[PDB]
Structures are given as C-alpha cells and as structure tokens.
Amino acid sequence: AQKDEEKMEIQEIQLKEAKHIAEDADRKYEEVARKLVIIESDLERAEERAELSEGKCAELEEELKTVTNNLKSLEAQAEKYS
Amino acid sequence: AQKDEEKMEIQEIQLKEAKHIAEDADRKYEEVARKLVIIESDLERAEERAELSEGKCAELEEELKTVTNNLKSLEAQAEKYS
Amino acid sequence: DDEETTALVCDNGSGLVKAGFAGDDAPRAVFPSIVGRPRHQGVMVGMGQKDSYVGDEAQSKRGILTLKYPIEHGIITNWDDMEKIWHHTFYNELRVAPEEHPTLLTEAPLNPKANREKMTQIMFETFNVPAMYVAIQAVLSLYASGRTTGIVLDSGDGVTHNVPIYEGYALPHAIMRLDLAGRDLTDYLMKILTERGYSFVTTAEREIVRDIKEKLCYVALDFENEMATAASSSSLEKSYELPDGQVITIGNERFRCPETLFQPSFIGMESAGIHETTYNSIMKCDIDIRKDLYANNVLSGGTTMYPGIADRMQKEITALAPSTMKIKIIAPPERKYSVWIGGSILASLSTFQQMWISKQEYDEAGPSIVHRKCF
Amino acid sequence: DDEETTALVCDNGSGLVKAGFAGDDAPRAVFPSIVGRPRHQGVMVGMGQKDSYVGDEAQSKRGILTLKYPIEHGIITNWDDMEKIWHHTFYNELRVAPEEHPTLLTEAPLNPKANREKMTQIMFETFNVPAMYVAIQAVLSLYASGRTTGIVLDSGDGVTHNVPIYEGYALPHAIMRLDLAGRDLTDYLMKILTERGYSFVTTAEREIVRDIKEKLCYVALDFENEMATAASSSSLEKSYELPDGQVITIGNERFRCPETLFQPSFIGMESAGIHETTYNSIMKCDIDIRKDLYANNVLSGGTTMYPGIADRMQKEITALAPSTMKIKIIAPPERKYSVWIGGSILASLSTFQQMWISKQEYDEAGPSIVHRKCF
Amino acid sequence: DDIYKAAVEQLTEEQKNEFKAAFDIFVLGAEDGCISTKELGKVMRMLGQNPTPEELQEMIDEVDEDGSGTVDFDEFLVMMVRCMKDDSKGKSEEELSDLFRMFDKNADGYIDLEELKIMLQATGETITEDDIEELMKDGDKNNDGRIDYDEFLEFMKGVE
Amino acid sequence: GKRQTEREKKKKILAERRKVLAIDHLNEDQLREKAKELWQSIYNLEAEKFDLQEKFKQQKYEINVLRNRINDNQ
Amino acid sequence: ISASRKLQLKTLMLQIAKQELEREAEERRGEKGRALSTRCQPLELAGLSFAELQDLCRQLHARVDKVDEERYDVEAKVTKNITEIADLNQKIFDLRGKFKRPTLRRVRISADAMMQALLGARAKET
Numbered sequence A, B: 001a002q003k004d005e006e007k008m009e010i011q012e013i014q015l016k017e018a019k020h021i022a023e024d025a026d027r028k029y030e031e032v033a034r035k036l037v038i039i040e041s042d043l044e045r046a047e048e049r050a051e052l053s054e055g056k057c058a059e060l061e062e063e064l065k066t067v068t069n070n071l072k073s074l075e076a077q078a079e080k081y082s
Numbered sequence C, D: 001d002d003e004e005t006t007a008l009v010c011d012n013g014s015g016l017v018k019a020g021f022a023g024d025d026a027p028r029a030v031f032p033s034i035v036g037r038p039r040h041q042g043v044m045v046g047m048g049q050k051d052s053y054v055g056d057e058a059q060s061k062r063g064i065l066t067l068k069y070p071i072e073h074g075i076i077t078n079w080d081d082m083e084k085i086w087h088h089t090f091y092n093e094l095r096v097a098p099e100e101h102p103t104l105l106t107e108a109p110l111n112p113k114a115n116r117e118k119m120t121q122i123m124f125e126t127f128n129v130p131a132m133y134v135a136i137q138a139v140l141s142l143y144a145s146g147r148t149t150g151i152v153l154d155s156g157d158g159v160t161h162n163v164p165i166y167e168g169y170a171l172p173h174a175i176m177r178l179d180l181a182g183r184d185l186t187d188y189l190m191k192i193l194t195e196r197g198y199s200f201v202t203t204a205e206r207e208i209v210r211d212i213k214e215k216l217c218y219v220a221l222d223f224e225n226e227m228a229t230a231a232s233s234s235s236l237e238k239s240y241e242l243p244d245g246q247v248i249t250i251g252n253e254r255f256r257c258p259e260t261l262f263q264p265s266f267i268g269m270e271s272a273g274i275h276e277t278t279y280n281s282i283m284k285c286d287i288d289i290r291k292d293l294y295a296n297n298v299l300s301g302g303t304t305m306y307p308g309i310a311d312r313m314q315k316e317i318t319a320l321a322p323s324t325m326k327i328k329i330i331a332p333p334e335r336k337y338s339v340w341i342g343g344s345i346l347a348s349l350s351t352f353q354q355m356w357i358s359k360q361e362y363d364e365a366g367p368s369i370v371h372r373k374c375f
Numbered sequence E: 001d002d003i004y005k006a007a008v009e010q011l012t013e014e015q016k017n018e019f020k021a022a023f024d025i026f027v028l029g030a031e032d033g034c035i036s037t038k039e040l041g042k043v044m045r046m047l048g049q050n051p052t053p054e055e056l057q058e059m060i061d062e063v064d065e066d067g068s069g070t071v072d073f074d075e076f077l078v079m080m081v082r083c084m085k086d087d088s089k090g091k092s093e094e095e096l097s098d099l100f101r102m103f104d105k106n107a108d109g110y111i112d113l114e115e116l117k118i119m120l121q122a123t124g125e126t127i128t129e130d131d132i133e134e135l136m137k138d139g140d141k142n143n144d145g146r147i148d149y150d151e152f153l154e155f156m157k158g159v160e
Numbered sequence F: 001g002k003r004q005t006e007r008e009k010k011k012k013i014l015a016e017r018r019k020v021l022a023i024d025h026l027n028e029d030q031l032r033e034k035a036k037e038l039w040q041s042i043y044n045l046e047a048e049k050f051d052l053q054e055k056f057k058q059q060k061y062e063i064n065v066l067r068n069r070i071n072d073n074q
Numbered sequence G: 001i002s003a004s005r006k007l008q009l010k011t012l013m014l015q016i017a018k019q020e021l022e023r024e025a026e027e028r029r030g031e032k033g034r035a036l037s038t039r040c041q042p043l044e045l046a047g048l049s050f051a052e053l054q055d056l057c058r059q060l061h062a063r064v065d066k067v068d069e070e071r072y073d074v075e076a077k078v079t080k081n082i083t084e085i086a087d088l089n090q091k092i093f094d095l096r097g098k099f100k101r102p103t104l105r106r107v108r109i110s111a112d113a114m115m116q117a118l119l120g121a122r123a124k125e126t
C-alpha cells in the first residue's frame, strides 16, 4: 500500500507536467505555422514580381539590340553615300 | 490496496500517452521552425533579385531612348543624302 | 465615339489573326490562329474542360493539345475550324456582335475562287454581317506606306507574293506568287537543329522552334563569308533557354534558316529567291515605269522582319539591276501590321464607302457576287 | 445530418485501412489490415475464443497469432481475408449497413484487371451496395493539395507510384510504378538489425520492427557524411525499449533503413531510387509542361513521413534538373491521410454525383463495367 | 444565427444568464475565469463527445480581434451563430446580382465611387463615415476603389 | 451535311413561320372574324418580339457584368 | 455604426436597390405596353365588305410571317446570350469555386443541437 501510494503520487505529478508541456507545445506550433504561411505568401509575391521585371528587361534588351543594328547599317550606308 | 494499484496502473498508461504526445509535438515544432527559417532566407534573396532586375530595366530604358534619338538623326541625314 | 457605324477590319492571315476597328493605329487583338483539341484522356471531374481551345488560350495549354492551323497556304483547308476562329475573334476578342458592323477581310493574290466565295457565304449567312468586302493583301500594304506606286513584297507566314503597282493601276500580269514563307522556314529550322542533337517533333514544339527563329535568326549580308567565319571563331553562338531549362546553343544555324528565302533550293523548291522574283516581276512591267518601281520597292509582312534583310535584298537587286538606276528598299518599322494599318486607312475613306457588298446585292446574285464589279 | 444520403469513402491501402463518411477532415476508423488465426492449441474452455481476429484486435493478441496481410503489393492475394476485412470495416468500425451507402474504393495504378473486377463484383454481390466507384490513388492526393497540376509521388506501404498530371489531363504514358515501399523497408531494417545481435523472426515481431522504423529512422541529407560521422562519434545512437524491457541501441541503422528508397540496390532491386524515377517521369512529359511539374512536385503516402526526406529529395532533383528551373516539394503535414482527404473531397462534389457505377448498369454489363466509360 | 448574434450582443437577462450558469457549472475541472484553449477543450470533451479541435480553434482565434487563444464576448456569439449557417451571406446571388446590375448605373460591371456614394445617400440609414471607409477598403481586394461583384459579395457576407 | 442542315433550317424559318392563310372561303362575317384573329396574332407576336428584345438586352447586360467580374478576377 | 448596425445599413441599401429594381421593372413594363400599343393598333372591324377584308387578311398574314421571322431571330439572339452567360458564370465558378471546399465536420454539432445531444432537452434558444 505504501509503495502504491508513492507511485500514484509521483505519476500524478508527472502527468500534470506532461499535459502542461503539451499545451505549451501546441500553442507554439499553431503560432509558428501561422507565421510560416504568411512568410510563404510573401515569398510567392516577391518571386512573381521578380519574374515580371526580368521579362520586361529581356524585352528591352531585344529592342535595343535591333535598333543598334539598324543604326550600324545606316552609318555604313551614310559613308557609302558620301 | 489492489484497487488503488489498478488505478495507479491506469495513471501510468496515461502518463506514457502524454509522453508520446509531447515528443510528437516537439518534433513537429522543430521541423516547422527550420522550414520557416529557410523560407525567410529565400524570400529575402528573391526580393534582392527583384531589385536588381528593376535596376536593369531602368538602364535599358535609358539606352533605348538614346539609340532612338540617334536613329532619328541618322534617318534625317539619309534623306538629305537622297 | 457614338452614333454612326464603324467598320471591322479583320485580317485572317495565316499564323496571326489581326483585327480591330477601322480608324486606329494598331490592331486591337492579335493572337495565333490555332485550334487544338485535347489529346489525352482526362481524369479530373468537373474541371470544366472544353473540347477545343482556340486563339491565345491554346498557346498556354499547348502541353496537352494538338494545335493545327486552319489555313495552310493562304487557302483555307478546314472550314469548321476557320468558322470557330472567326466566332472567337468577333465575340471574345472584340466583343462586338457582327450584326451591326461591316467587315473587310483580306485575301492573298491568285487564290482559288471557292475559298473567297465560301468566305463571303459564311460572313453573310452565319455571322450575318451588314456588308463585307475582300481586298488583296498587297494593295493595303501599299496604302499604309502612303505611296501610290511601288512594288510590294508581302512575305507573310503562309505565302509570299509580289504585286507591282503604278499610279494606282495594278499590273495583273506581273504578280509573282511564291509559296515559301515563314512556316517553311520554321520547318527547315526544326530540321537543321537536329544536326546538334536537339529533336523537336511534336506539333507543340513547333511553337518553340518558331520562338527560336524569331529571337535568334538573322539574314547574313554575305553568305559564304558568314559560313567561313562561323566555322572558325565562336562569336556567333548564341544560347537560348527552353521552356524547362537545358539551354541550347545555336551556331551557324542562325543565318542558315532565313537564307532559304534567297536560295529556295535548300528546302528542295525549284524557284528563285525573293531577291530574284522581285527583279523578274519588275522586268515583266513596261519599260517606262521600271525606274519608279526600282526606287519604291516596299517590304511588308511578318517574315521580312529579320535583322539585316533590307540590306541583303538591296545588295542583291543592285547586283541584278542596271548600274544607273537607284535601288531603294522601304522597310517601315511597323512592318508586321502594315497590311492591317492599310486596311484601316482604306476602310476609313469616304470614297470607298459605296464599294461594300451590300446584303441585298448578295441575296440577288448569290455568293458569286464577289467576282463581279464589287471585287 | 439527416435525410439524404452520404457516401462511404473507403481506402483499402496495404497496411492501414482508412475509412470514413464523405465530407469530413479525417478518416473515422484507421486500423491495420491483418487477419490472424491463432496457432497454439488452447486449453481453457468457454473462453470465447474466435477463429480469426482482424483489424486492431489482432494487434493486441499478436503474441499468439500468425498475422498475415491480405494485400501484398497493391494487388489482393487472398480474397476471403479481404472480404473479412471489408465486412469488419463496414459493420464494426463504422456500424453502417452497406445497403444504404455508395462506396468509393481506391486502387493503385497499373494493377491487374482481375483484381478490380473482383473488387466490384464483391461490393455488388456480397455487401450489395447501391453504387461504387474506383479511383486512382494519386489523383485523390492531388485533390487534397488543392492543386490542379503537379506530379505526385505516392509512396505507400505496398507500392510507390508516380503519376504526373497537368491541368487535369493525366498523362498515361508517364506513370512510373515501382514496387519498393514501406514493407520492404521494414524487412530490410529487420535484416540489418541482425548485425548487432537482435534477431526478429516471427511475423508478430515484424510489427515491433515496424514500430522501431517509425519512431527512430530518418533520411540523411548526405549519406556518406552521415556514415562517416556515425562511425566516429556516438551522438546518433538512440535507444528503444522493447515490449518486455531489454532496451536496444540503434546506431547507423537509423538512416540506412530509409536510404533504400534512394538506392534500391541495397535490397537487390535494379531500378533507380525515388529521386530519379520522378525526374524520369517528368522527362517523359512534353517539353512545355516540365516547368510546372518541377515547381509543383507533391509528396503523399505514409512512407514519405521520414524526418528529412523533403530536403534530400529536393537536393537530389536539383542536382539532376537544369539549373534554371525552380524545384519545390509540397509536403503537407497531413501526408498520411492525404489520399483519403482527397477521396472525401471528390465524393462530396456535385459534378461527380453522376459518375457512380449504378447497380442496374452492373446488372446489364457484368463486372467488366469498370473498365468501360465509368472508369 | 443572423438574429442570434445581434440579440446576444445586447442580450437581456435570459440567455446571458444561461451562459453565466454554464460558466459556473464548468468549475468541474475548468476554472480559468476567461475561456482559454485548454479549458474550452476540456469543457467540450466533458460534455460527452470529442469533436475535431480544428472547429474550436477556428472559433476561438480566427474571427477574434486578438486571436490569442482566449474567448472574447462578440466572438463567442460569432461561434454560437457559426454552428449553423442561418445568416444568408447577405441575401441571395440572384437578388444581389439584380441589385448590383441596377447599381452598375454606367453598365460597366463595376461600381464607381461617385454613383456608389449617391446610392449610399439614397439608402438613408444611419451614416458612419468611418464605416464608409471600412466598406471602401473591403471593396479593395484589387485596390482599385471600385467594387465589383466579388468584393461586393465579400463585404455583404451576413448582411441581414 | 451541316451546311445543308443550315440551309434547310433557314428555309423552314421562311416557310413554317409562314402559315396557311384561309380567308377567301371565310365569308364576309367569317372574314371579319379572321381579320380579328390575325390582328390578335400579330399583336401578340409583336409583344413577344418586344419582350424577347428586352430579355436579350438584359442578358447582354448580365454577360457584360459577368465578363467584367472575370476581368477583375483575372 | 456597430457591426449589426452596418449590417442593417447594407440591408437598407439592398432594400432601396430592390425598390429601384421594382420601379424599373414597372416602368419598363408600362413603357413597353405603350410602345406595343403604338405598334399594335386595333383596326376598325365594321363597314368593310368581303374584298377589303380579304386584302387586309392577306396583309395581316404577311405581317405575321415577318414578325414571326423577326421573333425567331431575337429568340436565337436570346439563346446565344444564354449560352454566353452560362459560359461566363461557369468560368466564374472555375475561378472562385472547386477548391473552395469547406471543412465538412460531422462532430461540430449545432450549439443547440450539440447541447441537446449532450444534455437531453436542455437547449432551446438557438
């Protein structure tokens, strides 16, 4: 009986400890998951903005290349015209 | 004594269950935290890339306008040649 | 705008349908003319999967479609698909019912009659337009340049035709129509890419090869010197990123693809290049208008947008032509939409307002009205 | 709830049967699929000893039973036991008679026809359901993620299969089914534990080895570095208490058991790991949907729950794939029940309500109706 | 639910005292005074059933102006009215579509600011310019100032 | 023959919407009766025409509204 | 205005909009009746002998055929509009439906229903 009372007491104490730790862990898990979702959304928006900017940059590169080639051709023709 | 011993056994079972739940919660928490850190770093990198791309686009716009003006002038010169 | 009634300047083309209201500077909606049925099975239920994606929608889902152009070489080979394309163009890209708008289609020279008659019959029966008129694709490109003479080489994507015009009087005996165009250049590029290891076979990957051709290829000023240079140095090798990675490097395939225009023997065609069919088209004209045609050579159409073609063509013609004449090649920056700009100008004219084929006239003479006075 | 009629979303699986009514978040009853006859003699009279304990009851009396799974690799090898499992699932774990509820079974890709036909024949003759429908286990896992594209790697306990899907159009020629799964990992772990002295042989002790695998094993980010570290330090040795005491210490067996997934040469299988069959499954797809599949790689199934697999797989694919594409691996926390959640969503749809195989249809065409339009 | 939330916000003795009596009964294990997550879960479990905690957590943190795991006043009534769906999202899509198409006086499929404010003047209800700006921001999902049918239905959720 | 179907459909529109008119056998009194019935038919037809026009206008308006909703969402 | 107060504000907005819609429909019907009366003009029945009635009936038949063909055209227009609006509404559903699956829970009983099932007949308010 004495041994059983000791075991019941210590087990009850440890169970209270474990349940409180579980409550803490669940709360922290919820908060961190919410923060993760927010950060993921931010990353997606940053990625799409960067992609759009890069596409526009590539188009500008192409256009400037074309106009430069036209300028070179016209310069050669101007020398010939002189 | 025997009744209290049975109750103590039930308490032991519940303590074991609580231990397992706490361990599972801890694993989930650490995994999510590490993932969040990585995602935050990647988001910062993406935003920096977007900044670089915007700078490139502005420079290309400047170049395009310059070459356009030059082309107009050369075209007028060619017409006079004609 | 408001009261009154504006005309629809549609331009079927072959490869890009360009449309818009008369009186503007640029077409309102430009989108590829492809109709692609899905080819796999499809397991998701309720996804809202349609039976045919047309226009620019099928250039985004092209991974699981089998795109097929409804216009082969100017002529129309699949009338149901062409009707679908027109219906899309009217209702979704412009959102104007055709019951209240005249239409101005465009047609290549020397095309089969049945094509034109079926086109007018469709426009009058299915879409039920008030009045439609069909115009030759080169006269419009001459309108857009603001000229009234000149010989225009309209190298589209389906067919390349070369219509000489003087003082507004077209010369019907000097039209030289050649069936080499952008599509054959795409196929030849897709065929010579296999010499490095890249194999494109699917009808969806033809679009990728078309993008490669548009962004990288250029016309060499002198072919042999470029072939010699590309075989020694490596200053020409430009790389390009596929829709999934695995960048590719194009070597002397860059100027060999569009060289087919000036040497149609590459794809096995017998005829002479676009540099010599223009000179032949000029020489068929009378002896007194050859100087004006020499001085006012006009380029149009999409395929004439290759970087460096306005110099190669001038060099070739100057080699062929007599040394005294001046050879000038008009290459406006708005080459691609030149035909449509000319179409808008023509539809906006007051003198032209009584040339439309009114519906009552069609009801009295049938579809064969188009060959009659209302041309 | 009340009037109306709810569907039963059963999911046979191989290792855990998951079932529940359509429209919820989690399966109502999850229990191992094992049927174990007693093997000893039995001397107590009137103890009420049954002849076969199925489900979760045989995981508590497993000390005197011979558990045997009725599903080997997706396919069903012992039809009487499978019928017993289904009967238990319907009557004791859900307590709903099947005469008043549609059922939605799930089946791995590329399975023998006879298995599916026998399944539908059983469901219609023995249990006498109103209507049943069989769905591929990967499309559901794609439903649960809320996507509509993506390539899903559903590494269950019986068989690992990798179904790519784009825009709702499944690609039947790119399904790569591999028969390495959780059960082979359990056997390999049980085989490498013998290198320390622990011998597990009985079919009951396979469950203990499975518990060890679930609780301790993890996938190494880099295999050689972990093998070198575990051979010098002792920071990895984690201990575990058997069902009777005598704790055991697992050394570098921790990350060697699940490494078999990425190197199937360990258990003598020829094929490539799950890191390379995904890349091969992608490369069989068309060239224009590879970017989307790269960005939407989905993980599912139980065996993909190892701590640290979503990073190892991403590292491997990034090594294989072109450097420009972005590789992203979707690993939802509810991985284990992903297939069943997707099944619930699919059964709850209104558009899907007319795809069930109604009983009168089965009466008219026989069990071979499943291969027909009602897939 | 549409009547329940409004009535319970300024509830009389009867059902508020019912809530207080429930709180006083809950002292068989839960004594936090202000309903936290774990005490709420314990109370719900001791009732005799074990519902999925996701519903409880969305009740206790989503609709709240704090979302800290505690229970506020108005959000408790939000939970009470969220058990069922009686507040009909602010009328029906057919009636809403009719009122929006007549609201779209220039017939362009969007609600401009000027005709919106003119119609608001036509409403004649109690006017709160702060609430007007709140509705303006609710109609800015795409941040154009205009309210199309999407955001129109969005901020009309529960309009009874 | 889909085109044949369209042509026979428009022919049936021009023919069946035409009815068999019988007023010469209807005597002066019955001719007045037939005139009254024809007026009632044509007035009802015009009412149906106007109602169809108004419904088409409202359907086009709802089409514009839904398309604008799509554009805002896209 | 409070949350309930602004809900009632938008409710009165919907009420005024319903008033406007009802008056729009009433004036639409009245003015269309006026327009039809301008079109559908009753003619004099008495005083005409046989031949004039026959000619008038021929004219009425021709007008009936014409307006019937016109009604066919407008009905085809209405059918096209119905098809287009159906496609647009389906695309609306595709854009903001499908993946809008709610969390269907059979263990979140109604507060009154849950309290009754766990206590008997205790819950009667909600």
Ligand SMILES: Nc1ncnc2c1ncn2[C@@H]1O[C@H](COP(=O)(O)OP(=O)(O)O)[C@@H](O)[C@H]1O
Pocket (backbone or CB within 6 Å): C012, C013, C014, C015, C016, C017, C155, C156, C157, C158, C182, C183, C186, C210, C213, C214, C215, C301, C302, C303, C305, C306, C336
């Ligand atoms: N910028 C470009 N550079 C090179 N080729 C081009 C370019 N743009 C278009 N093309 C080619 O021209 C074709 C489009 O020609 P287009 O004038 O639209 O034909 P159509 O006369 O039928 O309208 C495309 O198929 C493409 O191959």
Ligand SMILES: Nc1ncnc2c1ncn2[C@@H]1O[C@H](COP(=O)(O)OP(=O)(O)O)[C@@H](O)[C@H]1O
Pocket (backbone or CB within 6 Å): D012, D013, D014, D015, D016, D017, D155, D156, D157, D158, D182, D183, D186, D210, D213, D214, D215, D301, D302, D303, D305, D306, D336
């Ligand atoms: N938490 C876990 N960690 C590691 N492995 C697990 C875990 N849970 C389950 N498994 C493995 O996955 C298997 C269950 O897979 P499951 O998805 O149930 O298969 P099925 O597709 O037949 O339902 C078990 O046999 C076990 O080996």
Ligand SMILES: [Ca+2]
Pocket (backbone or CB within 6 Å): E060, E061, E064, E066, E067, E068, E069, E070, E071, E072
């Ligand atoms: Ca709170």
Ligand SMILES: [Ca+2]
Pocket (backbone or CB within 6 Å): E103, E104, E105, E106, E107, E108, E109, E110, E111, E112, E115
């Ligand atoms: Ca408006």
Ligand SMILES: [Ca+2]
Pocket (backbone or CB within 6 Å): E138, E139, E140, E141, E142, E143, E144, E145, E146, E147, E151
């Ligand atoms: Ca807005």
Ligand SMILES: [Mg+2]
Pocket (backbone or CB within 6 Å): C013, C014, C137, C154, C156, C157, C301, C302, C339
């Ligand atoms: Mg053209």
Ligand SMILES: [Mg+2]
Pocket (backbone or CB within 6 Å): D013, D014, D137, D154, D156, D157, D301, D302, D339
């Ligand atoms: Mg599975």
